[PDB]
Amino acid sequence: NKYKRIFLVVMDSVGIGEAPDAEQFGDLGSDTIGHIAEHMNGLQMPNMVKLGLGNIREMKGISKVEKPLGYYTKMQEKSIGKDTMTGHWEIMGLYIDTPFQVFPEGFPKELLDELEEKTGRKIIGNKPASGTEILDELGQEQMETGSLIVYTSADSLLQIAAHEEVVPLDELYKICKIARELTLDEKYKVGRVIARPFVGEPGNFTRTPNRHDYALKPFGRTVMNELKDSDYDVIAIGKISDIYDGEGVTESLRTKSNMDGMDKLVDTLNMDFTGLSFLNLVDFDALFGHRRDPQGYGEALQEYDARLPEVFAKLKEDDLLLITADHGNDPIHPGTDHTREYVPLLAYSPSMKEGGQELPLRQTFADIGATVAENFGVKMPEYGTSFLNEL
């Protein structure tokens, strides 16, 4: 192995400008990092800049350096979706040609009729809601009738709530497996079905820990699967294990915040593993992009950048650090959805004694997966082209 350890960091949603196909996704004008930098009157990410961020693209406060520490370029998404699952699946060697559906006016009647027919229970609600709100609204009716509450969010989710005394947990889990099968159809294709059992009574309903999730498996064997199969470590930090439905994961390190995720990254630098340590930093997307909060996004980016020196100091000569994103989510764009953007790519090892250079633009995010696969001598993904031998 050329590198013993690869540390891969996805700054979730940290896009570096509208992609060539942004118009088809309603995303003309989008620029995540750029528009944050404008809002801040200069974004301050001095560690990312020394890696080469400004050499990718100069932005306010983000300037070129003569001798970047690592290699730098951007990557273009090939897959049809701009969601977190698609972007991550593509990073790890896949090509996804159907989108995950969302249902802002509720699920279509034909899907709900099928679910009612197969379960023998009637369905109520059928709208975007928070869990708390929909129980307050419909919990009593659900208890009294034995119906199922089906609700969704702005994300590709189908959630089914029922009182544990009224619909036994075993049946609720069977109902969700049925729903999971029905939602494999391309017209109804949802990212995750979630069992939402609750207890209590009107004015005091509680969602129980008996929640279970039925996520879609990645559409093919990933580079993570190949690493785990070949007896390497695959250390998933944060939402990574969920995004891949555990496929190829050997250790899952749960996190509660971006700073907790950088702590866990450091924990893995301190571990004697051979393989991949893979971090998702989700707060960028969930708290700043989706909430259209550019000031918050800028502060969060600055906080993240201030953690990098500690990472740099613990990298060894045969370690490689890769920093990228999975899509954009421009916090001044209309609506609340992701934005179809190029993503940055920085590749740094302290063995780069001459500093890095510009890499050719990556035509698919799967170039990351292909590089990781070539490094560890595992079977090459069907999509992507390695840049291992250019480092």
- Interaction of residue 242 with Mn ion, rule CB under 5 A: no
Under DSSP, is residue 225 helix (H, G, I), strand (E, B) or coil? helix
- Shortest Å, Cβ 65 to Mn ion: 28
Q: Cα 160 vs. chain centroid, distance in angstroms? A: 23
Considering only 18, 27, 242, 319, the residue that binds Mn ion (CB under 5 A) is 27
**In the window 270-309, what residues touch Mn ion (CB under 5 A)?**
285
Looking at the DSSP bridge assignments, the partners of residue 358 are 72
**Any known ligand binding at 338?**
yes
- Shortest Å, Cβ 285 to Mn ion: 4
Distance CA 48, CA 112 (A): 48
Q: Does residue 176 contact residue 196 with C-beta atoms inside 8 Å? A: no
Which amino acid belongs to residue 191? G
- Shortest Å, Cβ 288 to Mn ion: 11
Selected range binding Mn ion among 123-131, 161-169, 322-330, 367-375, rule: CB under 5 A: 322-330
**Any known ligand binding at 35?**
no
Instruction: List the structure tokens of 229.
Output: 């199969």
Distance CA 271, CA 258 (A): 20
Considering only 21, 26, 250, 299, the residue that binds Mn ion (CB under 5 A) is 26
Under DSSP, is residue 343 helix (H, G, I), strand (E, B) or coil? strand
**Any known ligand binding at 326?**
yes
**Any known ligand binding at 290?**
yes
Which amino acid belongs to residue 9? V
Please name the residues in contact with 225: beta carbons below 8 A apart, sequence gap of 6 or more. 247, 248
Strand boundaries in 44-108, DSSP class E: 71-75
- Interaction of residue 84 with Mn ion, rule CB under 5 A: yes
If the CB atoms of residues 77 and 285 are measured against Mn ion, the closer one turns out to be: 285
If the CB atoms of residues 124 and 282 are measured against Mn ion, the closer one turns out to be: 282
- Interaction of residue 12 with Mn ion, rule CB under 5 A: yes
**Any known ligand binding at 333?**
no
Distance CA 229, CA 223 (A): 10
Q: Is 193 exposed, middle or buried (0-12, 13-18, 19+ CB in 10 A)?
A: buried
If the CB atoms of residues 12 and 77 are measured against Mn ion, the closer one turns out to be: 12
If the CB atoms of residues 19 and 223 are measured against Mn ion, the closer one turns out to be: 19
Selected range binding Mn ion among 6-14, 234-242, 300-308, 348-356, rule: CB under 5 A: 6-14
Q: Does residue 356 contact residue 52 with C-beta atoms inside 8 Å? A: yes
Q: Does residue 98 contact residue 189 with C-beta atoms inside 8 Å? A: yes
If the CB atoms of residues 26 and 350 are measured against Mn ion, the closer one turns out to be: 26
- Shortest Å, Cβ 91 to Mn ion: 11
Distance CA 121, CA 105 (A): 22
- Shortest Å, Cβ 191 to Mn ion: 11
**Any known ligand binding at 319?**
no
Q: Is 389 exposed, middle or buried (0-12, 13-18, 19+ CB in 10 A)?
A: exposed
Q: Does residue 81 contact residue 64 with C-beta atoms inside 8 Å? A: no
If the CB atoms of residues 84 and 241 are measured against Mn ion, the closer one turns out to be: 84
- Shortest Å, Cβ 102 to Mn ion: 11
Considering only 31, 326, 330, 374, the residue that binds Mn ion (CB under 5 A) is 326
Selected range binding Mn ion among 218-226, 252-260, 324-332, 379-387, rule: CB under 5 A: 324-332
If the CB atoms of residues 27 and 283 are measured against Mn ion, the closer one turns out to be: 27
Give the binding-site size for Mn ion (rule: CB under 5 A).
6
Strand boundaries in 139-250, DSSP class E: 148-152, 157-163, 192-201, 204-207, 212-215, 233-237
* Binding residue numbers: 12, 285, 290, 326-327, 338
The residues of the shown chain that bind Mn ion, judged by CB under 5 A, are 12, 26-27, 84, 285, 326
